[PDB]
User: Which sequence fits this backbone?
């Protein structure tokens, strides 16, 4: 059951990520696409790709028989679901398993037992999780790695407290401001919870930290979270490669929780307008200019001339920025967002520029005020909404200036 | 006396690197550009830009008069020289100091004392450097020093640059692999002792040959923050150009001691040269340029789509930097990145890199590898097939002459 050819059934940036991971593993990367995505970067990047009919996710990507028939015609050995449509579906996982493809992910039994929140409540209880008995709670997340043998590591704790509509938008690692006692509790509790569940693979435990630092267990995601990069860049673990090992069932070579070497931020570059209440704004990508440079990583499902219809989730790309300290990572994030430009779409880039500037998010350096309601409730939203010249370059005494004047003088 | 505004006195990727370092530090950046570079990324990316009006390095960036004049006209408090041009010109360094601008680099006396091979040959003996009294198949291994004006010295890391042409680094990696810890310890302590006896401050690289059967010899210190620095900067986790800003400020070293390197990194220089033609350079249009992206991959490009390359300047267009938890992983990830990276319209060494990261001599057996400073030109099986106006209008304003170079036709 040693992975060889992987059908990555997901669209977008996570498809690109798993294709790249498979290449790094030397595995053969197969992809699949909906009618709108027939030219998307993941489709062109894969070693081969297969077409599926229809336009909605329900036609294109959710149909078990489609994805399994594509794996059959590919002769794919493995399936990977990404972080999207299939990934939480235990019934699909079962169907893949009994089709006999190596399912890169947790047992359907585990996905069910952790999804059934009554059952998951009893799991947490048996695990002796810090269950709840909050105001302005904070969101913190143990990235658990667990093997089929029951070795468990906490690769690092993220913070994901910048949310609107319970969607994350900005994510942080290691979790900025926790007492050592809190971090120890979080780690050990996570290990206990996933062992009590017998979970294996990559995963995440979402915890919610109240004001004054009470911890409530929230949930286990049972999937690779979109948030994965900030714990990759802070720990050094290649989580998807580890996930391939675990699917192989090789022991976890990581014996102990890696000390995080620095600080990292992630920004979800969604196609929605903070001035328009973060409503999607589907349309053309007239230009796309990633901020490739020092301390910056980019992941994207979108490229120059891409067309972004409404059929799928709005998140185009993830910008990941890393430094030796939170201060330095902030400065680098400011520069990276200042240089990153996207044209023709409304994007959350102005909001990210704002919040990375906002004192409320900078904080005192000993504590900060961001809470999961903050973007909804207390951020002074001043991002004004979204939507020829002739441009000439004039040198005045040798000083370079750009001038834009009416295209009709 | 602190830095506040920096003239980034160079062309290309190092210009962009130091502009970005400035943007991070919150320092205003003034670029200068020769006429060929009027649309380069650095000129469109800096906060301010001044034309030098020269066609060639001899006509332009090397002219002290012009670049000091630009410094005046922009009011830069400080000047940062890139990894070429005047960066090791002590007379220029002196001129900048006499201008009173913060020269972001070593003292002119140090640049002299270590540029003169005789003086350096005295200095290294007085430092008691490890020395061999020539080698057949030497490796090139170099220690990145950091030093403040106070005398704290840190070895940021040891870097292997043995994939060289006779005169040109092509692929670089850190930490220097396949060394005994005894050898490292010796190259670390020797790099400090040389740096302290030089009285050096700023960023610097100390270069050694490591021979077959492990004989170590010092070669030279290059008193510049070398083009190969990013691999060290990410493996050590030190923003070396920032630290260079700090030391130009004269702060004590923040880093108190040599950090333990974490993982492994490679840096591939995308020279605009035909490996299949004998590494001959050529001019031409970069008609397309799509960088690799995603995990463990970084690109520092001085060149952009629709950029055109004239032969009067450094053939180095961009450099690709790839990092991993271990050398094997980093090699794998580089074999991906060099495959994803595509450029078209210009001869580039990308195929040679793609080959060498696939060639066993550089992959090594696990504790040794066969690459040596001659190996590329002497033993690599070269598989690769060859690739195939301004209207300067004078205005008088209250009697001040003011040339305005407009775009010509309009």
Assistant:
């Amino acid at each position: 059951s040693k992975i060889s050819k992987v059908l990555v059934a997901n669209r977008g940036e996570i498809a690109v990520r798993v294709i790249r991971a498979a290449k790094d593993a030397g595995l053969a990367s197969v992809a699949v696409y909906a009618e709108p995505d027939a030219d998307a970067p993941h489709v062109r990047l894969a070693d081969e790709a297969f077409a599926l009919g229809g336009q909605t996710s329900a036609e294109s990507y959710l149909v078990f028989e489609k994805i399994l028939d594509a794996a059959e015609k590919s002769g794919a050995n493995a399936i990977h679901p990404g972080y999207g449509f299939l990934s939480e579906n235990a019934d699909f996982a079962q169907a893949v398993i009994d089709a006999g493809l190596i399912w890169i992910g947790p047992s359907p039994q585990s996905i069910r037992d952790l999804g059934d929140k009554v059952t998951a409540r009893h799991i947490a209880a048996r695990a002796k999780a810090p269950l709840v008995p909050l105001d302005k709670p904070r969101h913190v997340e143990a990235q658990v790695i667990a093997d089929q043998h029951g070795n468990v590591v906490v690769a690092g704790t993220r913070d994901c407290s910048l949310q609107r509509r319970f969607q994350k938008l900005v994510e942080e690692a290691p979790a900025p401001f926790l007492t050592d006692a809190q971090r120890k509790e979080i780690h050990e509790s996570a290990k206990r919870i996933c062992k009590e569940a017998g979970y294996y693979g990559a995963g995440t435990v979402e915890y919610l930290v109240g004001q004054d630092g009470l911890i409530s267990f929230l949930e286990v995601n049972t999937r690779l979270q979109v948030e994965h990069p900030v714990t990759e860049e802070t720990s050094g673990i290649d989580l998807v490669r580890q996930q391939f090992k675990i699917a192989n069932g090789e022991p976890l070579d990581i014996t102990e929780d890696p000390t995080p070497r620095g600080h990292s931020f992630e920004f979800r570059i969604n196609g929605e307008d903070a001035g328009r209440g973060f409503l999607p704004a589907p349309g053309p990508v007239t230009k796309f200019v990633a901020p490739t440079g020092p301390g910056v990583r980019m992941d994207s499902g979108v490229e120059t001339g891409s067309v972004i219809g409404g059929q799928f989730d709005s998140m185009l790309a993830k910008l990941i920025v890393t430094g030796a300290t939170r201060e330095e990572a902030l400065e680098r994030s400011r520069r990276a967002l200042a240089e990153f430009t996207v044209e023709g779409l409304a994007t959350v880039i102005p909001f990210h520029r704002a919040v990375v500037s906002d004192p409320a998010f900078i904080g005192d350096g000993e504590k900060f005020d961001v809470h999961t309601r903050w973007i909804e409730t207390e951020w002074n939203n001043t991002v004004e909404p979204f939507t020829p010249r002739q441009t000439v370059v004039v040198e005045v005494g040798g000083r370079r200036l750009e001038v834009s004047l009416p295209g009709d003088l």
Observations:
- The radius of gyration of chain A is 22 Å.
- The longest helix of chain A spans residues 180-197.
- The CA atoms of residues 142 and 167 of chain A lie 18 Å apart.
- The interface with chain B takes residues 16-17, 20-21, 23-26, 45, 229, 232, 236-238, 261-262, 290, 292-300, 323-324, 328, 331-332, 334-335, 338-339, 392-400 of chain A (CB under 8 Å).
